[PDB]
């Protein structure tokens, strides 16, 4: 499912294993001129072998490489092959790796899972409650939460939310505190010192609110 | 520790010269229901007004309507100072003139037609340099106060002479038209209206916040719902009412372009709206540009679809720009856009209920002489399931139905129409009853 | 406070030389069924006609047909003046000619074929410069009146000599063809026909209204079926 942490995990892994990271943002290629689309796709690899060991990461692969039934187009397909050429042109010994992210297997062209290129396929599904809680924790980490804030509860009620869902849930529940103290600050009329911010608490009723907002 | 400063919020009483506080806040500033208060605001600007209690109004906040905020130069959610003013003397002379762009068309005696029933038996507190609005003759007339005898500010008691002298005047650069669209033009859906503001409040209104904190605003907002349900409206309202820069992407209007020159626009649209930020970029009729890929049998039909998503991501948080969109249904559009990167936030501007219908009916009847038998409450309660275009034209054609009858009579005179002829023009429950057949 | 002015509305009797008022409005202008009335209209223009009672017709309005309105230069819903005319004398001479574009094709004796059964035993009130229509020979013939002996205006009693002399004439710039299409060419659907007019009445006919009021017309109309 979308926003489940795919684009995240990838940039984590590279930053955390000090690998060189190059991003191929699906749409960002398809937005290019015909052929200049391919011209990028080469340089992407070409560079990521120069800066190896590297991860080349393809966000939103179904944008570039859909099932051929979907590819009513000559240049729409010319790219689909152009990828597979470079995916094979990838040496083992280039020690370069390519990670990709799509929304579902059916989305994409089957050829890529050919055990030559994308042989290895991971199911980044949804969170369970424990996972939810974990993630809630991960975005609350720079904020003064109030003693009544019970993330355990939050997670436990929020069945089936991905980590974008849970991450914005925070953002808007913080913005909801900022609004109240913001009214008060507006009377001062002052822009905000960190010290002002440090005093800024976030509450279970600030969370409760951001729950009304649905996804 | 700053008591007399206050926040600005919506009018519940939509009379021009009335502002409303909470009941505590009156006790705090030692004010009495009916007292003439004076309010100061940005750009050295003053307004004078009548204060009242509102049970609903929050202690921190003050309820006022556009007419007011306009002369104060503020928009909703800004701050102003309020102080009592029991030193205001009854006026002898008031030199008022109309703003040319609210009077090109109607002819006749404004003094009689608009000013007379407006000022009558109201004891209004005005001020030299105010700009006010009158509702009749099937339009709205905007008047500026050039001089008053107790200068700067005075009350208008029955005794007062009203100088109607001469020219209609041109509009000054920063005085916006009260004719322009705003929240007070909207009806039915109050919930959604709030949700919109609060998302867009911080980034539009306090744009320098988000460079100073790691937190992120919305980038994109999407509008669900049936057609003509107020989507294009709400959007233009919000921008005009939060003083944001507004750029319109009219779906078809892009698809009508040449291939690629379609994209070329779509870039400049954003490119400009980052130059004039904080900004709303509004996409009307999104399903015209970005349908499900199953619908996009086309290379260039799809090239655009991605081209959007590129710019929607190329949108910085810190650009403090927001993009709103309007489609007819979720299934219409490409799913990728609701990727929690771009159009994460999605509002269901549905249909009206009866209360909402009524509200809207009211909103278009506001410039017309209705007859005592006209029972909008009825009209709403029978019109189940009508959108606010339905209800708005319903008015227009029920007015046109009155114009037809009086028009036969006018045709015998053969005269074109003075406003005065308009002001006498009544609209009836049988003129409404008719437009219902349609 | 302007009695003799009237609105123009559809013909229920589609004879050329008959206009129809309400029964009150005849009592108001002191007119009798069968009386020859004279009607004035825009661009200095006059027509003369026979008046009748119509029970259905609204007091404010006058029923007439295109033949009529044409010579008055008016369209439906306009205003004209009507005044009695019992001073009209029987005609001796009438110099009528056909308009070339309603006669290219048919050959033969127009005098006999169209004019004769038309004028016969009708006692029609015509006027110098009228344009009238005759229905036969699988077409319609348009005739203009160039001169009459009791000028300007006269009645056509059996006695009258009808000069058919010479040329078919060309059409003048502002005189529209009665051949042209109109509501009288339409049938069956009366309701819809009304609904159309009224929507389109105000913006087409009174176009300067909608710059002077905030209200809006229809822009678009669609036709099912
Ligand atoms: N499991 C998780 N832990 C922490 N953050 C998450 C998680 N899943 C999603 N997020 C947040 O939501 C976003 C996920 O987007 P992303 O991984 O780019 O999704 P996709 O490629 O699936 O659209 C990130 O920007 C991140 O802050
Ligand atoms: N709730 C409402 N309050 C006031 N006016 C409304 C409302 N809903 C619709 N209208 C009227 O109908 C029109 C709505 O069309 P719009 O919102 O632009 O819809 P869309 O993009 O769905 O076609 C506006 O011009 C407005 O005058």
Residue numbers in the entry:
A (entry chain A): 246 to 460
B (entry chain B): 21 to 458
C (entry chain C): 21 to 245
Q: How is this structure described in the published paper?
A:
As one of the most abundant cellular proteins, human p97, also known as VCP (valosin-containing protein), has been assigned an ever-expanding role in a variety of cellular pathways. VCP/p97 is a homo-hexamer with each subunit consisting of one N-terminal domain (N-domain) and two tandem AAA+ ATPase domains (D1- and D2-domain)234. Connecting these domains are two linkers: the N-D1 linker between the N- and D1-domain, and the D1-D2 linker between the D1- and D2-domain. The functional role that this 22-residue D1-D2 linker plays in regulating the ATPase activity of the D1-domain and how it affects the function of p97 are the aims of the current study.
Since all previous structures of ND1p97Lng proteins were solved using pathogenic p97 mutants, the solution of this wild-type ND1p97Lng structure has confirmed that the deviation from a perfect hexameric association of the ND1p97Lng is not a consequence of pathogenic mutations but is caused by the D1-D2 linker. In the structures of ND1p97Lng (residues 1–481) with ADP bound, the polypeptide chains could only be traced up to residue S462, indicating that the D1-D2 linker is largely disordered, which is consistent with the random loop observed in the structures of FLp97. We superposed one subunit (subunit A) of the hexameric wild-type ND1p97Shrt with the equivalent subunit in the wild-type hexameric ND1p97Lng. Whereas subunits A of the two hexamers align well (rms deviation over 426 residues = 0.65 Å), all the other subunits are out of alignment, as the ND1p97Lng hexamer ring is out of the plane of the ND1p97Shrt ring. Although this misalignment does not necessarily mean a lack of proper six-fold symmetry for the ND1p97Lng hexamer, which we shall define more precisely in the next section, it is an indication that the D1-D2 linker alters interactions between neighboring subunits. Although different domains or sub-domains have different Asym Index values, on average, the ADP-bound forms, for both full-length and N-D1 fragments with the D1-D2 linker, display the greatest deviation from proper six-fold symmetry, which is in agreement with previous observations on full-length p9723. By contrast, in all structures containing the D1-D2 linker, the electron densities for the side-chain of R359 is absent in all subunits in the asymmetric unit, indicating this residue becomes disordered in the presence of the D1-D2 linker. To reiterate, the multi-structure alignment of ND1p97Shrt with ND1p97Lng and FLp97, all in the ADP bound form, showed significant misalignment of the adjacent subunits leading to a side chain displacement of R359 that cannot be ignored (>3 Å). In this paper, we show that one such element might be the linker connecting the D1- and D2-domain.
